[PDB]
Amino acid sequence: RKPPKGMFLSQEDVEAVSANATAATTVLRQLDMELVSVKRQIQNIKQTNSALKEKLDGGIEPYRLPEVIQKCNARWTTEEQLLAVQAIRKYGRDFQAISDVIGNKSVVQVKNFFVNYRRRFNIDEVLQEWEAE
Amino acid sequence: PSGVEGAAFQSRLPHDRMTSQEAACFPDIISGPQQTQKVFLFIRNRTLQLWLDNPKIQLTFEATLQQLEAPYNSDTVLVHRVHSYLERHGLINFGIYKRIKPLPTKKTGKVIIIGSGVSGLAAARQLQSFGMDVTLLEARDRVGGRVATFRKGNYVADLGAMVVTGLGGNPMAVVSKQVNMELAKIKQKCPLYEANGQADDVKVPKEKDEMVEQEFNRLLEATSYLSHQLDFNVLNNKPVSLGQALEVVIQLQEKHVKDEQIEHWKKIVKTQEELKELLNKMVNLKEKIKELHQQYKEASEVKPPRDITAEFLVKSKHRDLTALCKEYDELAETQGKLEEKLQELEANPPSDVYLSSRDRQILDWHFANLEFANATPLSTLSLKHWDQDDDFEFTGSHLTVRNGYSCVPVALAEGLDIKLNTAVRQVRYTASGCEVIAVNTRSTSQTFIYKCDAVLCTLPLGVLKQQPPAVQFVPPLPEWKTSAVQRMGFGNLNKVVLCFDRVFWDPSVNLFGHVGSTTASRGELFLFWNLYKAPILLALVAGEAAGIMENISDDVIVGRCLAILKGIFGSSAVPQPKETVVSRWRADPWARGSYSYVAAGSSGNDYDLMAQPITPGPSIPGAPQPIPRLFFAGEHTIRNYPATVHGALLSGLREAGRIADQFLGAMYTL
Ligand SMILES: Cc1cc2nc3c(=O)[nH]c(=O)nc-3n(C[C@H](O)[C@H](O)[C@H](O)COP(=O)(O)OP(=O)(O)OC[C@H]3O[C@@H](n4cnc5c(N)ncnc54)[C@H](O)[C@@H]3O)c2cc1C
Ligand SMILES: COCc1cccc(NC(=O)c2cc3sccc3n2C)c1
Incomplete structure (x- = not known):
């Protein structure tokens, strides 16, 4: 009915290995070379990536910053207001980053801030200055 | 098989059907009513059985008719025809048997x-x-x-x-x-x-x-x-000869053996490429971090009290550095599971050879x-x-x-x-x-x-x-x-x-x-x-x-x-x-x-x-x-x-x- 379990035999393959008097051992060698070529190319990127892991040797412990969390307060201090304005200038709409920069304001508070002070901190002007980069 | 039917099988004939040979000599029957055929077949089969059950001695027509029951023993031209046909095409009385009726006095032909x-x-x-x-x-x-x-x-x-x-x-x-x-x-x-x-x-x-x-x-x-x-x-x-085809089937098996090996090592490399283009981002982040840490360090040593732009500079750089220490950990995780997935692949090779x-x-x-x-x-x-x-x-x-x-x-x-x-x-x-x-x-x-x-x-x-x-x-x-x-x-x-x-x-x-x-x-x-x-x-x-x-x-x-x-x-x-x-x-x-x-x-x-x-x-x-x-x-x-x-x-x-x-x-x- 169909080729024995695990025996492989496509129409195509047969025509191809029969085609000539030694298109048999052509095709078998063509793949032996094809194989070594790929084993050599492996030996290479094994050797390339080998070097690049030596350059990451040390991880990034020397550059890690300890963990500070203070409570997320409610009141806007003048100090905090300014940090914000500058953050906006540097970050645009990235409420997430801006919240982190200030420290003690949640990403909603930051979002509200935008719309309340919007008038008085000319945030329109500021945000298009960010886009000019 | 068992019965008269077993004689048929044992004589290389289908118990349940008339052969073309038989059709040749009994065209009346085989063109005829279903009934009559089934009679014929029993007769045929039974007669064989008899020969077989004792084949050290000849089976005569009489001996055969003797051993039949009605309706089968009833028509006796059919029984005689059958017996003769069998006899002729060595289905019965062949090999070495004791003769009952000693030989024709004189020989024809x-x-x-x-x-x-x-x-x-x-x-x-x-x-x-x-x-x-x-x-x-x-x-x-x-x-x-x-x-x-x-x-x-x-x-x-x-x-x-x-x-x-x-x-x-x-x-x-x-x-x-x-x-x-x-x-x-x-x-x-x-x-x-x-x-x-x-x-x-x-x-x-x-x-x-x-x-x-x-x-x-x-x-x-x-x-x-x-x-x-x-x-x-x-x-x-x-x-095409059989040997010819066997070679062809063997080659195709060795070919398949390779094609597996190839696409397996190609699976290996296509991962190595990912690993490689990850390791590059990972080197290029570690470099941006070294620099950024320094930058933060310098801005952190501006001693207070400080005006707010120079305060923001620290907070800013601080955040931007925890942002990159974030990303380098995603990549460092990925690196870990590609390297695992790599020994997986190099643990499970396909077959070395066909034979x-x-x-x-x-x-x-x-x-x-x-x-x-x-x-x-x-x-x-x-x-x-x-x-x-x-x-x-x-x-x-x-x-x-x-x-x-x-x-x-x-x-x-x-x-x-x-x-x-x-x-x-x-x-x-x-x-x-x-x-x-x-x-x-x-x-x-x-x-x-x-x-x-x-x-x-x-x-x-x-x-x-x-x-x-x-x-x-x-x-x-x-x-x-x-x-x-x-x-x-x-x-x-x-x-x-x-x-x-x-x-x-x-x-x-x-x-x-x-x-x-x-x-x-x-x-x-x-x-x-x-x-x-x-x-x-x-x-x-x-x-x-x-x-x-x-x-x-x-x-x-x-x-x-x-x-x-x-x-x-x-x-x-x-x-x-x-x-x-x-x-x-x-x-x-x-x-x-x-x-x-x-x-x-x-x-x-x-x-x-x-x-x-x-x-x-x-x-x-x-x-x-x-x-x-x-x-x-x-x-x-x-x-x-x-x-x-x-x-x-x-x-x-x-x-x-x-x-x-x-x-x-x-x-x-x-
Ligand atoms: C090594 C071997 C092992 C075998 N094993 C088996 C087996 O294990 N099982 C199995 O079932 N079958 C087996 N066979 C097959 C079997 O032996 C034969 O098919 C059988 O003997 C054929 O008989 P035959 O009458 O057709 O030919 P043959 O038995 O050869 O009889 C023909 C006769 O004609 C004669 N002859 C030839 N030339 C002339 C002439 N010019 N004038 C007069 N007479 C002549 C020959 O000498 C011979 O006696 C085997 C055959 C061989 C060679
Ligand atoms: C399951 O059988 C095992 C076995 C062991 C030893 C020999 C044979 N067969 C023959 O020698 C043989 C049988 C037949 S029939 C026509 C020719 C021939 N030959 C040569 C078979």
Whole structure:
């Protein structure tokens, strides 16, 4: 009915290995070379990536910053207001980053801030200055 | 099967239906009502059963009708017709039976039979039991032909046929009942013994053995798919051989072995690329971080109190640094699981090879064994047809003749006009009759001549093939016949008989293989046989090898043997042999080979051509179409049972019927 379990035999393959008097051992060698070529190319990127892991040797412990969390307060201090304005200038709409920069304001508070002070901190002007980069 | 039906099966006929043969002689019935046919069949079947239940004695018409019940015993022309038909086509009263009604006082018609093979001897008995005058002409000094049996003291061994290939449907079943035919079973277990450049040969372990055998079978099955489904049967105008197809199937397997390996290593690299282009981002982040840490560090050492821009600078840089220490951890995680996934891939390779050398040499034994059974290199077997007789195989385990097969042709030759040492040289057939010119094998000048109504030729296919001819036909045989001989294949295989004084092998083991080095000589002494209490080991030569071993002396051949047996059983434990015998079938001029095979470019249809008899031209032109004068039986004439003893036997029975029908008319369409 169909080729024995695990025996492989496509129409195509047969025509191809029969085609000539030694298109048999052509095709078998063509793949032996094809194989070594790929084993050599492996030996290479094994050797390339080998070097690049030596350059990451040390991880990034020397550059890690300890963990500070203070409570997320409610009141806007003048100090905090300014940090914000500058953050906006540097970050645009990235409420997430801006919240982190200030420290003690949640990403909603930051979002509200935008719309309340919007008038008085000319945030329109500021945000298009960010886009000019 | 069980009942009358079991007789039918045992006689190679369908209990439940009428054959084309029967339709030929009983057209009234088979064109008729369903009812009547089923009567007929019972009658037929029952009559057989009777013959079978006791085949040491003739079955007469009366004895038959006696044993019938109504409504079957009621119509007695039908019962008589049936009985006669069976009788005629050796379905009943064949072989060796005690006659009830002693022979016709005088004999009608004269037949010359060429060759006292089994095919011959059988027909002869039939013809004579039908009361024709029959004379056989054998060139040998002995009956059987390719049923040879070596004898010396109590040391008995078959050089010719030896195996009954199952009693289930075999007419030899009937014969084995009519003769002692001492029938041993064959214990199928065969252990293999691979050489070692001279190092002691190690048996093959059951793991290997079993695996390789299965690949072999799988490979065959493969060639069959290849033939039927893919229809791969011609190649550069020439018909594809089995060997040819096997190579192709093997290559395609080795190819697939590679293609797996390739796409596996390519899966490896396509990961390495990901790992590489990750490691780059990871180096390029670590660099941006080093810098950014410094930058933050510097901005953090601006001592307070500070104005708000320089405060923001710290907070800003602080955030931007925890942003990158974020990302480097995602990448560092990814790195971890790609490297895991990499050892996964390099842990699970696909297969190294399709078959090793040590494997491919064992497989070459399974091939030699096939080249043995078929008596020919697989390069010669027709892919499309080599296995055509496979649906007609009998049932039951295969057996051996313990007392030597020659017992049979001998028994058949009792009461027959056999002229031994009589080599036929020319066959002449004409509308008026046939004359056969023979010689005496010893002084060839001493010539003989026999006139007869009809000639039956059981000459072996190898003989019919000889060029220039060993036997001349006058007139020549037609295109269609000669072409058919040309096309068919006649193989070869030989046996070496080793007689000893003491039983140095394993007594409980029947047969055991040997695995030489190269494909090239896979057939050479590839298998050994034990049987009787007699210290006889038999060694077999097959395939391309057997043809070449005929050009090598008995002593060298017996050497190559012992060498093999020593390397298995130990150089001290292997005596020189008392009596040695080697067959040389392809060189034996009364066979010119072992037996037929379906050559590439032949088909089963040739076997039918071979059986077709010859009718001469009319003597006086425009005179009436003559009788068919020259007939053919033999192993090569029986499409469905070729190259066997039973095949020949049947072909014999068959011609006898055809001849009798021709020369003594049919009393059973009356
Ligand atoms: C080695 C071997 C092993 C075999 N093993 C088996 C087996 O195990 N099981 C099995 O079932 N079958 C087996 N066979 C097949 C079986 O032996 C034959 O198919 C069978 O004997 C054929 O009988 P035959 O009458 O057709 O031909 P043959 O038996 O050859 O008879 C024909 C006769 O014609 C004679 N003859 C030839 N030339 C002339 C001439 N010019 N004038 C007069 N007479 C002539 C021959 O000498 C011969 O006696 C084996 C064959 C061989 C070679
Ligand atoms: C399951 O059988 C195992 C087995 C072991 C030893 C020998 C054989 N077969 C033959 O020798 C053989 C049988 C037949 S029939 C026509 C020819 C032929 N030959 C050559 C088979």
